[PDB]
Design an enzyme around this catalytic site. Structure first.
Site, short mmCIF file in Angstrom:
data_model
loop_
_atom_site.label_atom_id
_atom_site.label_comp_id
_atom_site.label_asym_id
_atom_site.label_seq_id
_atom_site.Cartn_x
_atom_site.Cartn_y
_atom_site.Cartn_z
N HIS A 1 8.32 0.21 -17.77
CA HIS A 1 8.72 -0.94 -16.96
C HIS A 1 9.94 -0.68 -16.07
CE1 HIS A 1 8.56 -5.05 -15.74
NE2 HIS A 1 9.62 -5.45 -16.41
N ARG B 1 15.31 -9.62 -12.39
CA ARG B 1 13.98 -9.74 -11.81
C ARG B 1 13.62 -11.19 -11.48
NH1 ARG B 1 10.76 -5.02 -13.26
NH2 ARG B 1 11.87 -3.70 -14.77
N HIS C 1 5.09 -2.72 -22.87
CA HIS C 1 5.47 -2.37 -21.51
C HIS C 1 6.92 -2.75 -21.22
CE1 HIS C 1 5.09 -1.41 -17.29
NE2 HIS C 1 5.58 -2.59 -16.98
N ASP D 1 1.09 -0.91 -16.24
CA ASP D 1 1.35 -0.70 -14.82
C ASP D 1 0.57 0.51 -14.28
OD1 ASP D 1 2.92 -2.91 -14.81
OD2 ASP D 1 4.77 -1.89 -14.18
N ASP E 1 -1.13 -0.93 -8.26
CA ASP E 1 -0.13 -1.40 -7.29
C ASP E 1 0.79 -0.29 -6.79
OD1 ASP E 1 -1.03 -4.03 -7.17
OD2 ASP E 1 0.31 -4.69 -8.79
N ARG E 2 1.32 -0.48 -5.58
CA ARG E 2 2.29 0.38 -4.92
C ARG E 2 1.74 1.75 -4.55
NH1 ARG E 2 6.02 -1.76 -9.00
NH2 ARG E 2 6.99 -3.61 -8.09
N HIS F 1 1.11 3.45 -11.59
CA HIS F 1 1.11 2.77 -10.30
C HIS F 1 0.26 3.51 -9.26
CE1 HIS F 1 3.59 -0.71 -10.94
NE2 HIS F 1 4.56 0.01 -11.48
N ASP G 1 4.62 4.17 -16.61
CA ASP G 1 3.98 3.65 -15.41
C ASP G 1 3.29 4.75 -14.62
OD1 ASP G 1 5.58 1.65 -16.40
OD2 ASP G 1 6.13 0.87 -14.43
N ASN H 1 2.97 -5.69 -16.67
CA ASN H 1 3.10 -6.91 -15.88
C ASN H 1 2.32 -6.85 -14.56
OD1 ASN H 1 5.22 -4.94 -15.34
ND2 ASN H 1 6.06 -6.42 -13.88
N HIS H 2 1.89 -5.66 -14.13
CA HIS H 2 1.05 -5.54 -12.94
C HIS H 2 -0.44 -5.66 -13.24
CE1 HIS H 2 3.74 -4.46 -9.50
NE2 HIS H 2 4.58 -4.28 -10.51
#
Ligand code: MN
Ligand code: MN
Lengths: 295, 26
Positions: free
Chosen positions: A243, A216, A168, A87, A90-91, A61, A59, A119-120
Site C-alpha cells: 500500500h 489520504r 494490503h 493493487d 491502475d497507473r 499496478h 503492489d 484498495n484499487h
C-alpha cells in the site's frame, strides 16, 4: 471449457521482448478467468490461513513485465508458492495482462497461489486511475464490470502459520477479533469507512501515538504501540502489508514488527525505487529478494 | 502439495544474508 494452459502460454511468451508487447486474450477467455477464479475466491476463506514456505509480493499496478521478472527470479508457479497483497491494476500500462496472469495462476494452482484485495480492486477507484480506460480501449465496458464482480470476492487478509498477519493496508481501530474479518460477506464493495476499508487503506506512521487521521483522506494511521499491542493480543510475530512505495522495496516499522512490501520497481516511471519480494521458509525465517534496474 | 489450512517463530538471517539482489536491463 477454459483452456488455461493456452492462456498462460500466450501470457508468458512475451518474456524478453523489447518493446513491451501486449498480450491480447479473447473477451471470452478473460471472462472465463474472472468467473472461474471468482468461484475459487468464494469457496476459500475470506481470511486465508496459509502454511510456509511461500513468497509474498506487494503492489504491481499493471507493470506486467515487472511481474514476469518477479516470477523469473522467485520461481514460476508451481516452483514456488505465492501470496499477493493487492493493487494489481491502475497507473501502469498493462493492467489486463497483469491481472489475467494472476487469475490464471489462481485457477491453475488454487491452493499454492493466493491473491488478496487491494484498495484499487474496487470499481470506484479503478474507474479513475486507469483500469477502466484500459478495459474500454482494448475490450468493452461489460468486461470491466465482469472484473468488478470478480474483485468483490477477493479475500481480505491472510495469516501464515499463525504468526504473520497479511493485508494490503494495515490495522483497524475496529479490529478486536479475527472473527470480525471472517464475518464479512462476499461479494461486497469497499465501504468508505470501517474494518474492511481500514484493512485496505490505513498506513503506519512513525510520528503518531495511537490512531491518527490519514493524509489520504480515507481511514487512519497507526503508531508503533498499536502494532505491538496488536501482535501481543493475537500471538503474532509480524505484520506484512503493502500500500506504500518504499525506496528499497521493503521497509521495516516498529523494530521489525511490521514490514511494507512494494514489488513494482521504478513505480510507473516516477520513482527510482526498487521492488521487493519477501521469501519465508518453513521455519518462518524471512528474507528479501530485491529487484532493481542496473545502473 | 497445497498450503491452505482447513509452533513456529519468525526469524531473520545474519544481516549479510538478509537481501538478495537481482539486476535487470531497463
Ligand atoms: Mn498501490
Ligand atoms: Mn494501495
Amino acid at each position: 471449457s477454459l483452456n488455461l494452459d493456452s492462456i498462460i502460454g500466450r501470457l508468458l511468451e512475451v518474456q524478453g521482448s523489447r518493446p513491451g508487447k501486449n498480450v491480447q486474450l479473447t473477451e471470452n477467455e478473460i471472462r472465463g478467468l474472472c468467473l472461474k477464479s471468482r468461484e475459487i475466491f468464494l469457496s476459500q476463506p475470506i481470511l486465508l490461513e496459509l502454511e510456509a514456505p511461500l513468497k509474498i509480493c506487494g503492489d504491481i499496478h499493471g507493470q506486467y513485465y515487472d511481474l514476469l521478472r518477479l516470477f523469473e527470479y522467485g520461481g514460476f508457479p508451481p516452483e514456488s508458492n505465492y501470496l499477493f497483497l493487492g493493487d494489481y491494476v491502475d497507473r501502469g500500462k498493462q493492467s489486463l495482462e497483469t491481472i489475467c496472469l494472476l487469475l490464471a495462476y489462481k485457477i491453475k494452482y488454487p491452493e499454492n497461489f493466493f491473491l488478496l484485495r487491494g484498495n484499487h480492486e474496487c470499481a470506484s477507484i479503478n474507474r479513475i486511475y486507469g483500469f477502466y480506460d484500459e478495459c474500454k480501449r482494448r475490450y468493452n465496458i461489460k468486461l470491466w464490470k465482469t472484473f468488478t464482480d470478480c474483485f468483490n470476492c477477493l479475500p481480505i487478509a491472510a495469516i501464515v502459520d499463525e504468526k504473520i498477519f497479511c493485508c494490503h493496508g494495515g490495522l483497524s481501530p475496529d479490529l478486536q477479533s479475527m472473527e470480525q474479518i471472517r464475518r464479512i460477506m462476499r461479494p461486497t464493495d469497499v465501504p468508505d469507512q470501517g474494518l474492511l476499508c481500514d484493512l485496505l487503506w490505513s498506513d503506519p506512521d512513525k510520528d503518531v501515538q495511537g490512531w491518527g487521521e490519514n493524509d489520504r483522506g480515507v481511514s487512519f494511521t497507526f503508531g508503533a504501540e498499536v502494532v505491538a499491542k496488536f501482535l501481543h493480543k493475537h500471538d503474532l510475530d509480524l505484520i506484512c502489508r503493502a500500500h506504500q512505495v518504499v525506496e528499497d522495496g521493503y521497509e521495516f516499522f516498529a523494530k521489525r514488527q511490521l514490514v511494507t512490501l512494494f514489488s513494482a520497481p521504478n513505480y510507473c516511471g516516477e520513482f527510482d525505487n526498487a521492488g521487493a519480494m519477501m521469501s519465508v521458509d518453513e521455519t518462518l525465517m524471512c528474507s528479501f529478494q530485491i529487484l532493481k534496474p542496473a545502473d | 502439495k497445497g498450503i491452505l489450512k482447513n509452533r513456529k517463530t519468525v526469524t531473520w538471517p545474519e544481516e549479510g544474508k538478509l537481501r538478495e539482489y537481482f539486476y535487470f536491463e531497463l
